[PDB]
Amino acid sequence: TPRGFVVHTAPVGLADDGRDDFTVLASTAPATVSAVFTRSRFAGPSVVLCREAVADGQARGVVVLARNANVATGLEGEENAREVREAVARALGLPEGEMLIASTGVIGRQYPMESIREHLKTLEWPAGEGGFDRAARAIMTTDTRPKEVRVSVGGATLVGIAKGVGMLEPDMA
Amino acid sequence: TLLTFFATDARLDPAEQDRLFRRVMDRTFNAVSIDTDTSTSDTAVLFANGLAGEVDAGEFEEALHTAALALVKDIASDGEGAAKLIEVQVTGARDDAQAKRVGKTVVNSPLVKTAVHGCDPNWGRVAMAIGKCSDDTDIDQERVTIRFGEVEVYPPKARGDQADDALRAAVAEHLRGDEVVIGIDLAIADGAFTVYGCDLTEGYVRLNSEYTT
């Protein structure tokens, strides 16, 4: 419902069930960003890049991969986090540092990169706005239901989605 | 792993936006625990593009808070295997941070989480859990009060098993609900904090045993 926000969701085989597991949320307009993150010593490469990306208070979106965390995956996983974050930025014609990346699911398992590489080549701006409901579903792992909420304030809209019902006591900053 | 994203067409002062985002995060996503297992991946973001024009920072903050909380209670109700949301309300603490520390300890006690799961009004497990904050030497068991729902079960006023029996029985009733409140007052000062978690079920264990997640 908020103006300027579009959602891309698609299956990329992060699990083998044909379910939407790859999400791009993006603003068609410049956006100020606020974010907080895990301070885990095993913080995934996705997190580091997010921090860097929000350092200037400026970001327009986030790619999210579900059913693989891309954590404890070494230099390979670092490379893969960058490649994916960048290829999304590039495919939508945004600057790298305005695209975040987030990833959830199994620890210690490499991304299925060829499947993700093929999908990226097709990626472009969603026709039309909205689809948070789709994003809400595509981010799920061991959730039994999508989690979504909408508030109106002073003529603007705020939509939130969340996921995560195990490995859950956030201590984010 | 927690992933949560917020999107608004609100225009906000960037510095106010960060401050208010943090305040709400601290009271919501950083106030929930299913299994104490802080992930390697927790991410929470707000994007505010300007398209709907200026909004009052206080009105927005309020709105973000309601949005965040509703999502947090969603997560707590949907905890892996859970049947019951647990809400721990701590008051009278030295400061808010101690109230949060005690709430977390209690809502993360496996014995508290299973008693609630069985509907067993084993409030002595909540006294234990509070007791584990053994570096907070200003918490005095003589001054602490414990309730489930609206039923104060500690301290014993008078005897004897009373009393505890009846009201034990009343705690058993409230426990039958899908949302359970544990109120705790430390009678130290004005520190207050509410945290959210859930019960511990065979379902949690089976999922996470069977089950590569």
Swiss-Prot record, chain A:
Site (Involved in the stabilization of negative charge on the oxyanion by the formation of the oxyanion hole): T104, G105
Residues noted as binding substrate in the record, renumbered to the chain: T141, K163
Superkingdom per UniProt: Bacteria
Full protein name: Arginine biosynthesis bifunctional protein ArgJ alpha chain 3
Residues of the full protein shown: 8 to 180 of 393
UniProtKB/Swiss-Prot annotation, chain B:
Binding site for substrate: T1, E80, N208, T213
Catalytic residues (UniProt): T1
Domain of life: Bacteria
Protein name in the entry: Arginine biosynthesis bifunctional protein ArgJ beta chain 3
Organism encoding this protein: Streptomyces clavuligerus
Lineage: Bacteria, Bacillati, Actinomycetota, Actinomycetes, Kitasatosporales
Gene name tied to this protein: argJ3
